[PDB]
Amino acid sequence: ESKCPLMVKVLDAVRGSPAVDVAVKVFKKTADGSWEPFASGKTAESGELHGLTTDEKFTEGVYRVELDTKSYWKALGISPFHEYAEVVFTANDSGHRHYTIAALLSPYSYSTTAVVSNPQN
Amino acid sequence: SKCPLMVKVLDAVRGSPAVDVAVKVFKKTADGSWEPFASGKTAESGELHGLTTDEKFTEGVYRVELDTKSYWKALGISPFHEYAEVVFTANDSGHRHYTIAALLSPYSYSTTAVVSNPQN
Amino acid sequence: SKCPLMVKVLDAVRGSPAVDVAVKVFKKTADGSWEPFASGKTAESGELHGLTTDEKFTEGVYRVELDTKSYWKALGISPFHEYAEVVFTANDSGHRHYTIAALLSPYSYSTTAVVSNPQN
Amino acid sequence: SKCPLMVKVLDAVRGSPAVDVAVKVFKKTADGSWEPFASGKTAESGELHGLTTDEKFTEGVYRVELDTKSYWKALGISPFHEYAEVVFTANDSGHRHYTIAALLSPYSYSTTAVVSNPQN
Ligand SMILES: O=C(O)Cc1cc(I)c(Oc2cc(I)c(O)c(I)c2)c(I)c1
Numbered sequence: 001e002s003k004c005p006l007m008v009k010v011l012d013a014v015r016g017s018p019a020v021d022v023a024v025k026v027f028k029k030t031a032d033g034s035w036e037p038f039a040s041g042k043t044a045e046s047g048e049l050h051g052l053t054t055d056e057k058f059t060e061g062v063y064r065v066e067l068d069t070k071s072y073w074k075a076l077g078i079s080p081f082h083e084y085a086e087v088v089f090t091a092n093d094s095g096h097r098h099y100t101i102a103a104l105l106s107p108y109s110y111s112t113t114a115v116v117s118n119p120q121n
Numbered sequence: 122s123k124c125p126l127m128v129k130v131l132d133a134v135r136g137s138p139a140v141d142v143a144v145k146v147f148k149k150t151a152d153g154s155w156e157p158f159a160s161g162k163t164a165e166s167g168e169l170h171g172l173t174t175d176e177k178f179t180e181g182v183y184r185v186e187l188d189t190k191s192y193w194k195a196l197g198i199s200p201f202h203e204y205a206e207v208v209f210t211a212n213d214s215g216h217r218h219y220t221i222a223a224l225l226s227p228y229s230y231s232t233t234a235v236v237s238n239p240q241n
Numbered sequence: 242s243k244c245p246l247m248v249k250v251l252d253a254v255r256g257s258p259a260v261d262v263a264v265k266v267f268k269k270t271a272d273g274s275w276e277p278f279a280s281g282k283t284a285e286s287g288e289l290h291g292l293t294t295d296e297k298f299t300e301g302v303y304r305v306e307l308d309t310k311s312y313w314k315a316l317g318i319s320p321f322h323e324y325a326e327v328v329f330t331a332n333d334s335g336h337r338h339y340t341i342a343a344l345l346s347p348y349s350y351s352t353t354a355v356v357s358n359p360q361n
Numbered sequence: 362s363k364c365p366l367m368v369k370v371l372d373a374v375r376g377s378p379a380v381d382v383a384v385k386v387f388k389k390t391a392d393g394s395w396e397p398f399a400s401g402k403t404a405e406s407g408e409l410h411g412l413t414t415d416e417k418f419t420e421g422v423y424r425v426e427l428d429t430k431s432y433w434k435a436l437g438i439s440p441f442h443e444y445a446e447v448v449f450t451a452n453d454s455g456h457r458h459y460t461i462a463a464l465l466s467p468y469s470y471s472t473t474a475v476v477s478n479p480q481n
């Protein structure tokens with residue numbers, strides 16, 4: 001069971017390595033249905049982004065995780081297909097859980113999976 | 122009519138085309154807003170045709186939204202994602218044919234674009 | 242045109258069909274050794290048709306091997322995989338139509354099967 | 362703790378690690394024959410560590426086979442594939458660290474490799 005409330009991990013399918021320095025923006029949908037900034041960061045050398053939120057701050061609701069894939073590919077001299085990659089999901093609606101959002105990137109393709117686990121507390 | 126934009130969806134659990142997946146296509150407007158561009162449901166083939174024409178499908182940023190949540194729920198499955206969206210710039214250099222492919226699983230999905238042109 | 246066994250290959254890097262990919266299909270014998278069943282190369286559409294017919298495509302275990310190494314090498318890329326292979330038992334139950342789809346990247350690939358109903 | 366070769370498997374239907382998946386690793390010989398190299402089963406994390414060491418994991422062509430059929434069948438699911446095979450050349454260009462990742466669905470799977478430089 002992952003100890004991280006909201007972990008984001010990104011891989012590069014072209015190089016077979018972590019996707020380093022990918023800008024990640026997380027938003028939380030409010031009562032009126034609008035998106036508000038929730039947390040932000042960039043992937044480390046491991047391709048993982050640690051420190052997005054504590055369980056206390058990660059309240060029940062719909063979340064949007066945005067990966068700036070365009071800037072990632074353009075920095076390498078590649079003109080990608082997508083404007084960005086977005087993962088939208090409902091979280092903690094049936095008790096608190098720990099989430100890991102994983103993404104695999106290619107210039108014209110991306111895949112994403114989620115690993116949901118229930119912590120000790 | 123012609124089809125410069127196509128959407129093809131597969132179901133990874135049943136090993137077949139994803140039927141009745143609700144799709145909504147939007148196009149970015151002059152001042153940054155999204156305007157409804159096209160809509161429909163995937164057929165028995167998992168493909169959605171007749172979305173637009175080469176004349177209507179002009180240069181710009183497009184957003185393709187697949188209602189994966191409803192699709193899985195109607196199959197008695199509680200999926201992870203609310204939906205799956207694909208955002209891209211199209212026809213920035215001429216007028217090509219775009220095929221947005223998607224592979225669905227309850228907690229995962231992959232999407233790929235196949236861009237083509239009248240090759241010889 | 243093909244009917245029982247089809248192979249479709251896409252390129253996730255270039256956003257296009259993977260053309261001229263060498264495909265080899267093997268089949269398990271009575272004892273337990275692989276045996277050449279069919280071969281070909283993907284066309285411009287990224288598809289390989291005419292591998293067999295409903296008559297020769299009998300029940301058993303098959304192995305579809307895609308020469309991905311040569312595909313990437315020709316583009317100047319040194320991929321991870323020696324090749325991509327799909328092993329499955331076919332027509333064990335009913336004689337349906339099989340489509341093996343593959344999405345390729347230098348260090349990654351995904352394969353999916355679409356088994357179509359013989360009745361409807 | 363592991364270092365040279367690691368295997369990680371995820372379940373796309375349940376959104377969790379794929380536990381107890383049987384893994385068998387083979388290494389090619391001089392005449393092109395495969396010989397047993399290492400084997401084990403994924404733990405609760407969905408990972409398999411300690412398959413080999415740097416001294417043991419020398420240059421060569423390896424074959425990593427995941428028994429995906431048994432995994433799905435045990436859950437009552439009828440999968441398409443007999444297994445998922447990952448064939449690759451290793452340590453040819455210096456002794457690196459390899460991570461073979463796989464995401465499983467009943468009728469589909471994707472595999473990715475993460476190659477890193479340890480004390481390079
Ligand atoms: O393909 C998809 O649709 C989803 C997906 C994305 C990634 I990126 C994966 O790879 C890893 C590799 C390591 I190393 C991890 O620790 C984790 I969590 C996921 C896998 I499997 C599946």
Ligand SMILES: O=C(O)Cc1cc(I)c(Oc2cc(I)c(O)c(I)c2)c(I)c1
Nearest residue numbers: 129130131222223224249342343344353
């Ligand atoms: O237009 C048609 O005749 C139908 C069609 C189009 C494409 I493009 C296909 O290729 C793939 C390969 C993989 I791997 C996928 O996950 C997906 I979604 C589509 C297939 I099969 C069938």
